[PDB]
């Protein structure tokens, strides 16, 4: 209850990029932070955007790609900018592309969404564990 109230007090900040945009969108959903709401924490996301835009072709299977989302992140106190928690999250997904360009792009974008969703889930669990420490006994 207070942990869920604490999670939605976290405002996710990302610099220009598809990865940070997708991860921020996923975290705003997972954290339940409503835009315009008061923020107790600022979560800064540093996605390796070049690595995230690159789907790497795999051997053995035709049009199979591996996509990697690497994120360094800092949790700050929204009032004084002190770093109160940090982390590193590395997520990998595969997508099975197609000879057709529309389908090939759809597969890649779905892979990117799935990477961002799993990265969001890993960070949300890490932050919920941190905010759970905050709950009295």
CA–CA separation, 24 vs 53, rounded Å? Answer: 16
- Nearest approach in angstroms of CB 63 to Cl ion is 30
Strands 41-47 and 10-14, sheet pairing: parallel
Regarding 64 and contact with Cl ion (CB under 5 A), the answer is no
- Residue 81 DSSP SS3: coil
The window from 38-46, 56-64, 102-110, 115-123 that contacts Cl ion (CB under 5 A) reads 115-123
- Look at the chain and count its residues: 137
Regarding 124 and contact with Cl ion (CB under 5 A), the answer is no
Regarding 85 and contact with Cl ion (CB under 5 A), the answer is no
Which residues contact Cl ion by CB under 5 A? 87, 89, 122, 126
């Amino acid at each position: 209850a207070g942990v869920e109230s604490g999670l939605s007090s976290i405002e996710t900040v990302a610099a220009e990029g598809r990865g940070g945009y997708l991860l921020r969108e996923q975290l705003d959903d997972a954290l339940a932070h409503r835009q315009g709401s008061p923020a107790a924490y600022k979560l800064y996301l540093s996605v390796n955007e070049q690595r995230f835009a690159r789907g790497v072709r795999l051997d053995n299977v035709a049009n199979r790609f591996e996509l990697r989302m690497s994120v360094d992140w800092r949790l700050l106190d929204a009032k004084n900018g002190a770093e109160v928690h940090k982390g590193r999250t590395d997520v990998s997904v595969t997508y099975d592309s197609a000879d057709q360009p529309y389908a090939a792009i759809a597969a890649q974008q779905d892979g990117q969404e799935r990477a961002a969703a799993e990265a969001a889930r890993k960070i949300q669990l890490d932050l919920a564990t941190w905010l759970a420490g905050k709950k009295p006994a």
